DNA sequence: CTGGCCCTCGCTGTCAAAATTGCGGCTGGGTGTGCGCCCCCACCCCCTTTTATAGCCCCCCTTC
RNA sequence: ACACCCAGCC
DNA sequence: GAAGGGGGGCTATAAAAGGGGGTGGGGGCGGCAATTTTGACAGCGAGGGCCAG
């Protein structure tokens, strides 16, 4: 008993299942039934030396499909199941392969044409304009993004110069938070004028050259 | 034919000396073989 | 006077790890690179409104003159370029409205106007005053109106300006009102939204220009024009 | 000139190489021939 | 001191691959064409207040 | 200039 | 809820204050086809040392 164990009762019973290949129209019709319970019937006849297989469509669903059997020994076809409880089980092994073909030959090509037409509905190709487009690059006093940015800039305003002790308090919180820093991020965190930050940082801080990215300031007084 | 190791002579000035000349030019095929190799010429 | 280095051709051209040992280290000045950036931006700006190359060349000339004269170092090169494009368009007799140059630039009407004023001061030159006529072929064609309407609008705007019916109104506003009140006289009709968005004028600007131009309706039209609509049938806002 | 003027008239190609290719074969060293032979 | 044998080692021939230059002679047309990132340092513009002026234009209010 | 076509005669 | 209307801000100039922030200008960091040459390899010679001679 385990999550990944595969149950093999079906194999021990040697249950034989049928693998059937059907076209799109039959599957779509069966899906349209909304799981009513029945969608058709299958007729298997056995003569003295031959076997005939066919599928009879339900008359209600519409408002004769011959079946061809193929070789089975080419590959070992089986089926397994996975559930919401993460339990793996093997339903069984495929014992025979089936191919479904339409009885109609010429009139079914009309349905094929309709299917192709439906498949070509969403494919897009360029159109042609009778008149040149003039709705673009329309004159405007100012761009929307620009006026938005100026409105934001004038609501927030300039970052106000503060006394030395309080900016030093932000610096103290800063190199308590992290050892190393980048000049831009320090400006963003402290919210102070860049020249005033440089003036108050040069007195206590020093710049250390690095061969990896760029020279940077150090918040340690020593 | 490419950005401003590329094919050259893909586009040519249409020949307007005679109507037969224009038709012949509009229906021409070019082989990119260098201009040696007698087999592609046959 | 400089030359480029082409792509590598063999093993000797490359280095130990997937990179060429010779690179396109250009020796361009800051000045030449900044003004080439500006010419490239001017061409992009001009092709947005389908200006011919001669206006682009005139704009390049004005930009070079300003950039050598060196009096506007503090203004963005893109604003100087926009103002130069405006001056070049105005000098060729095919002026574009300030809002039209704004629409193809990141630079506002405030900033391009200030740079235009400052460029005119620096170059010690002058430009002809715009007449409600030059802004007609475009503002109409873009709105798709017949040629008899071209003549009607041109004549009527010129006559309205000539006899000083409209005091101090900008030529754009008078031109747009002419287009409005010559369009309804023909079969082809145009609402306020189209003319406003295609000429740059607001609805209140075009409405009060219409109410100013309305009373002298019949005397202002050209004599030889097909009145598809009666003169008294024009709707008053 | 007297040996190069006939060369303009000769054509190209048991098989024994002859014509302009053999003239190239002869006036060069050609350490590897085209059609070696021995008249034994 | 003399002679028979196998060893590391020096040198050579031989094969192979990479590297190299040229590929007819004249002629007549036409047609086109001419970095890049990220940072640091000087200099200038806008922030704000005042007031007159007027056309233009956004926003809110009101109508039906 | 340069380049690219085309073409003429062998 | 679309249309017309009213009130009010935006636009340009003007001097001036001081400083922040934007902008440029640095600015260093970042095809055939015979020949020719060289090398790599497989091989081989003479001699050394050992053992015998």
From TrEMBL, chain B:
It comes from the Eukaryota. It is found in: Nucleus. Belongs to the RNA polymerase beta chain family. RNA-dependent RNA polymerase that catalyzes the extension of a non-coding RNA (ncRNA) at the 3'-end using the four ribonucleoside triphosphates as substrates. An internal ncRNA sequence near the 3'-end serves as a template in a single-round Pol II-mediated RNA polymerization reaction. May decrease the stability of ncRNAs that repress Pol II-mediated gene transcription. This is DNA-directed RNA polymerase subunit beta.
UniProtKB/TrEMBL annotation, chain D:
It is found in: Chromosome; Cytoplasm; Nucleus. It comes from the Eukaryota. DNA-dependent RNA polymerase catalyzes the transcription of DNA into RNA using the four ribonucleoside triphosphates as substrates. Belongs to the RNA polymerase beta' chain family. This is DNA-directed RNA polymerase subunit. It comes from Sus scrofa.
């Amino acid at each position: 008993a385990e999550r990944g164990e595969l149950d093999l009762t079906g194999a021990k019973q040697n249950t034989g299942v049928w693998l059937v290949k059907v076209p799109k129209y039959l599957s779509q019709q069966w899906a349209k039934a909304s799981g009513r319970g029945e969608v058709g019937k299958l007729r298997i006849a056995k003569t003295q030396g031959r076997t005939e297989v066919s599928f009879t469509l339900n008359e209600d669903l519409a408002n004769e499909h011959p079946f061809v059997l193929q070789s089975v020994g080419g590959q070992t076809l089986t089926v397994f199941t996975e559930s919401s409880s993460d339990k793996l089980s093997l339903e069984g092994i495929v014992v025979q392969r089936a191919e479904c073909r339409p009885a109609a030959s010429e009139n079914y090509m009309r349905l094929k044409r309709l299917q192709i037409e439906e498949s070509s509905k969403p494919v897009r190709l360029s159109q042609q304009l009778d008149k040149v487009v003039t709705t673009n690059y329309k004159p405007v006093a100012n761009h929307q993004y620009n006026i938005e940015y100026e409105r934001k800039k004038k609501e927030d305003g300039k970052r106000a110069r503060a006394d030395k002790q309080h900016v030093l308090d932000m610096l103290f919180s800063a190199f308590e938070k992290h050892q190393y820093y980048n000049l831009k991020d320090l400006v963003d965190i402290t919210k102070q004028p860049v020249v005033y930050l440089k003036e108050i940082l040069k007195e206590i801080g020093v710049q250390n050259v690095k061969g990896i990215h760029k020279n940077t300031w150090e918040l340690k007084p020593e | 034919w490419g950005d401003q190791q590329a094919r050259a002579g893909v586009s040519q000035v249409l020949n307007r000396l005679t109507f037969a000349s224009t038709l012949s030019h509009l229906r021409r095929l070019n082989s990119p073989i260098g201009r040696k190799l007698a087999k592609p010429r046959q | 006077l400089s030359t480029m280095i082409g792509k590598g051709t063999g093993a000797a051209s490359f280095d130990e790890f997937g990179n060429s040992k010779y690179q396109n280290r250009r020796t361009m000045s800051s000045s030449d690179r900044a003004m080439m950036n500006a010419f490239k931006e001017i061409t992009t700006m001009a092709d947005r409104i389908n200006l011919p190359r001669n206006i682009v060349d005139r704009t390049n000339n004005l930009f070079k003159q300003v950039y050598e004269q060196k009096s506007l170092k503090g203004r963005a090169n893109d604003a100087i370029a926009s103002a130069c494009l405006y001056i070049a368009c105005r000098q060729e007799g095919v002026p574009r409205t300030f809002k039209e140059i704004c629409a193809v630039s990141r630079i506002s009407k405030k900033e391009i106007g200030r740079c235009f004023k400052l460029i005119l001061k620096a170059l010690e030159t002058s430009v002809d005053l715009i007449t409600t006529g030059d802004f007609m072929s475009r503002f109409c064609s873009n709105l798709c109106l017949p040629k008899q309407v071209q003549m009607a609008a041109t004549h009527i705007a010129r006559k309205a300006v000539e006899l000083d019916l409209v005091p101090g109104r900008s030529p754009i506003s008078v031109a747009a009102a002419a287009i409005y009140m010559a369009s309804q006289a023909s079969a082809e009709k145009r609402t306020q939204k189209e003319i406003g968005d295609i000429a740059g004028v607001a609805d209140v600007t075009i409405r009060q220009s219409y109410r100013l131009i309305y009373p002298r309706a019949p005397d202002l039209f050209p004599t030889d024009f097909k009145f598809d609509t009666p003169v008294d049938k024009l709707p008053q806002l | 000139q007297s040996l190069g003027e006939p060369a303009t008239q000769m054509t190209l190609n048991k098989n024994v190489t002859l014509g302009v290719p053999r003239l190239k074969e002869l006036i060069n060293i050609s350490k590897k021939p085209k059609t070696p032979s021995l008249t034994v």
